[PDB]
């Protein structure tokens, strides 16, 4: 009931077996399988040469080279394109034809992921992997000298390896689900939209991030390539000459070269390149016509970022004023000028007449950031996916479970990335740090997620679920709200549709100013 040495395209791989319980269940764990060669700075990934004998996949390998926590140093290595696999095993035979879920992490467009709980509770295979981030993942001139999107190609290389090789581990290669959060959710979305993945992906889950979020596509890469070159001493007059100089700069200097609202400081991210991303992502959804799709957000997703743009929200000691909010709103709506700043300010502060409390005003700032960074882009992606669906199902969720006491006792919510610990079963892996109801939420999310992996239907699979999750259509606009106490009223509809319509209809029709 164990895997032993596993035959892959590159050679034999040996993992470890961890016995779970006393009746014969276990899990096979593989860490550090290479899926591409050691990377070259600002060059596309390459096949990894095969190896002789048996590769011992016992330890996580280094991550890709990236800036530390205080932007003063680096960690990781150029030899970083590795993946890890968790295979659950029963008492009788070794597993076969299991659904495969590939996690793409986020954190680099705006750390420890262990697949054991999802795999064993959901009877699926979980894959994690590294891709290149920052300047080394996304530096670009916008043309063929330095086309960008290296990190997206890394992700695609890992998915293609899984398609070629996972059957030997007991996986079904025709049933691959991608799932990921923040940048990883946006990357999941971008992978479903790229022609590169045709035939590779069965379904996908975007958590707090889609290709349409405004922090995903850099439309002025050449401006950012120049700021890096000028700091590392490269010339900036020619594209082909700056690019080559960047390609032979110390990769640590490229990484540390670079250290107004938070969104204006999104730099080294995917670009529309005419190749991996052939067009604006909004025009690509026919590529996902047959990829089942969950997308969702957290109901306080924007709170961390509103806190950076306006620290006054996190202390009843200080106040947020109409003038502070107008300034924030005005910088987001610049391309529509004074007129666009006012219509937006007016719509969001309409409730301030009846409720002028700092609780309501500070909540409005959070809602504004949640809407424009996460919720509205996600609602547009759901509609776009639904509109282009042939066989694909579409599902929407809102994650609202609090993990901690709020600033105001009515700010019941989940902040950005709060969803990860529940999806990954941390309340069961380290239960002393968690409450009973936390395990209730985690149990339900793993059930929905891995049912969806197995069948494309979050309600149908190996696990019972608390409430029926109705597929999204243009007519029902339904979403599942995920809380510690779920029942039939957890299926809701029309989330903040007045603000959806404001952004998609009213704001779009206003003239562009210069």
As annotated, the active-site residues are 182, 301, 416
Sheet of 5-8: strands edge to edge?
A: 5-8, 11-14, 54-56
Considering the complex, what minimum distance in angstroms separates the CB of residue 172 from Zn ion? 7
Classify 399 as helix, strand or coil.
strand
CB 149 within 8 A of CB 132: no
Is 114 a residue that touches Zn ion (CB under 5 A)? no
Q: Which is nearer to Zn ion, 25 or 172 (CB)?
A: 172
DSSP E strands, 182-313: 203-207, 292-298
Is 194 a residue that touches Zn ion (CB under 5 A)? no
Is 97 a residue that touches Zn ion (CB under 5 A)? yes
Residue 505 CA to residue 513 CA, distance in Å, equals: 18
With tokens 């993942």, the residue in question is 137
Is 110 a residue that touches Zn ion (CB under 5 A)? yes
Is 154 a residue that touches Zn ion (CB under 5 A)? no
> How many Cβ atoms are within 10 Å of 250's Cβ, its own excluded?
10
DSSP 512: P
Among 32, 34, 251, 461, binds Zn ion (CB under 5 A): 34
Considering the complex, what minimum distance in angstroms separates the CB of residue 254 from Zn ion? 14
Among 109, 179, 434, 499, binds Zn ion (CB under 5 A): 109
Is 470 a residue that touches Zn ion (CB under 5 A)? yes
Residue 87 CA to residue 167 CA, distance in Å, equals: 11
Q: At what angle do helices 221-232 and 239-247 cross, to 10 degrees?
A: 60
Q: Which is nearer to Zn ion, 168 or 262 (CB)?
A: 262
Identify which of 293, 319, 324 has the alpha carbon closest to the alpha carbon of residue 397.
293
Longest dimension (CA), the chain: 73
List, in order, residues 6 or more apart from 317 with CB less than 8 Å away.
Answer: none
Q: Which is nearer to Zn ion, 118 or 183 (CB)?
A: 183
Residue 502 CA to residue 124 CA, distance in Å, equals: 41
Q: Which is nearer to Zn ion, 42 or 110 (CB)?
A: 110
Considering the complex, what minimum distance in angstroms separates the CB of residue 384 from Zn ion? 21
Considering the complex, what minimum distance in angstroms separates the CB of residue 448 from Zn ion? 14
Angle CA 398–417–186, to nearest 5: 80
Q: Which is nearer to Zn ion, 48 or 203 (CB)?
A: 48
Considering the complex, what minimum distance in angstroms separates the CB of residue 149 from Zn ion? 12
Q: Which is nearer to Zn ion, 343 or 403 (CB)?
A: 403
User: First CA to last CA across the chain, in angstroms?
Assistant: 68
Give the chain's length.
514
Is 183 a residue that touches Zn ion (CB under 5 A)? yes
Q: Which is nearer to Zn ion, 134 or 427 (CB)?
A: 134
CB 141 within 8 A of CB 65: no
Binders in 77-96 for Zn ion, by CB under 5 A: 77
Considering the complex, what minimum distance in angstroms separates the CB of residue 99 from Zn ion? 13
Cβ-defined contacts of 429-438 (< 8 Å, 24+) = 429/114, 429/116, 429/117, 437/484, 438/401, 438/403, 438/484
Pairing relationship of beta strands 98-104 and 171-181 according to DSSP bridges? parallel
| Contact mark string toward Zn ion, 285..314, x via CB under 5 A | ------------------x-x---x-----
Binders in 449-468 for Zn ion, by CB under 5 A: none
Q: Which is nearer to Zn ion, 241 or 252 (CB)?
A: 252
Among 367, 415, 419, 481, binds Zn ion (CB under 5 A): 415
Identify which of 115, 107, 112, 57 has the alpha carbon closest to the alpha carbon of residue 82.
57
Is 253 a residue that touches Zn ion (CB under 5 A)? no
Q: Which two tokens stand for residue 20?
A: 């779970």
Among 120, 123, 182, 187, binds Zn ion (CB under 5 A): 182
Binding region for Zn ion (CB under 5 A): 34, 77, 97, 106-107, 109-110, 182-183, 196, 261-262, 303, 305, 309, 415, 470
């Amino acid at each position: 009931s164990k895997l032993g040495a596993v035959y892959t395209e590159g050679g034999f791989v040996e993992g470890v077996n961890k016995k779970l319980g006393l009746l014969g269940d276990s899990v096979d764990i593989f860490k550090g399988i290479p899926f591409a060669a050691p990377t070259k700075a600002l060059e596309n990934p390459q096949p990894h040469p095969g190896w002789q004998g048996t590769l011992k996949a016992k330890n996580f390998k280094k991550r890709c080279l990236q800036a530390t926590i205080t932007q003063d140093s680096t960690y990781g290595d150029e030899d970083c394109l590795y993946l890890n696999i968790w295979v659950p095993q029963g008492r009788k035979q070794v597993s076969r034809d299991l659904p495969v879920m590939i996690w793409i992490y986020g954190g680099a467009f705006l750390y420890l992921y262990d697949g054991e709980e999802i795999a064993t509770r959901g009877n699926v295979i979980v894959v994690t992997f590294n891709y290149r981030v920052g300047p080394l993942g996304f530096l670009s001139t916008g043309d063929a000298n330095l086309p960008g999107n290296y990190g997206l190609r890394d992700q695609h290389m890992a998915i293609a390896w899984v398609k070629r090789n996972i059957a030997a581990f007991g996986g079904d290669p025709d049933n691959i689900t991608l799932f990921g959060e923040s940048a990883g959710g946006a990357s999941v979305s971008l992978q479903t939209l790229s022609p590169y993945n045709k035939g590779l992906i069965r379904r996908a889950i975007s958590q707090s991030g889609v290709a349409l979020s405004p922090w995903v596509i850099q439309k002025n890469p050449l401006f950012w390539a120049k700021k890096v070159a000028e700091k590392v001493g490269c010339p900036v007059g020619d594209a082909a000459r700056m690019a080559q100089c960047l390609k032979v700069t110390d990769p640590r200097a490229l990484t540390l070269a670079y250290k107004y609202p938070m969104l204006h400081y999104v730099g080294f991210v995917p670009v529309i390149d005419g190749d991996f991303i052939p067009d604006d992502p909004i025009n690509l959804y026919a590529n996902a016509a047959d990829i089942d799709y969950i997308a969702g957000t957290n109901n306080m997703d924007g709170h961390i970022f509103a806190s950076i743009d306006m620290p006054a929200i996190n202390k009843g000691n200080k106040k947020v004023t109409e003038e502070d909010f107008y300034k924030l709103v005005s910088e987001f709506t610049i391309t529509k000028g004074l007129r666009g700043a006012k219509t937006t300010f007016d719509v969001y502060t309409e409730s301030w007449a009846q409720d002028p409390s700092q609780e309501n005003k500070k909540k409005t700032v959070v809602d504004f950031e949640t809407d424009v960074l996460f919720l509205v882009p996600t609602e547009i992606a759901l509609a776009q996916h639904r509109a282009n669906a042939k066989s694909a199902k579409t599902y929407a969720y809102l994650f609202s479970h609090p993990s901690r006491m709020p600033v105001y006792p009515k700010w019941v919510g989940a902040d950005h990335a709060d969803d990860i610990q529940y999806v990954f079963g941390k309340p069961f892996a380290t239960p002393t740090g968690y409450r009973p109801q936390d395990r209730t939420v985690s149990k339900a999310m793993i059930a929905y997620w891995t049912n969806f992996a197995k069948t494309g239907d979050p309600n149908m699979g190996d696990s019972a679920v608390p409430t029926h999750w109705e597929p999204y259509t243009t007519e029902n606009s339904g979403y599942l709200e995920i809380t510690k106490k779920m029942g039939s009223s957890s299926m809701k509809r029309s989330l903040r549709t007045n603000f959806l319509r404001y952004w998609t209809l009213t704001y779009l029709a206003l003239p562009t100013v210069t």
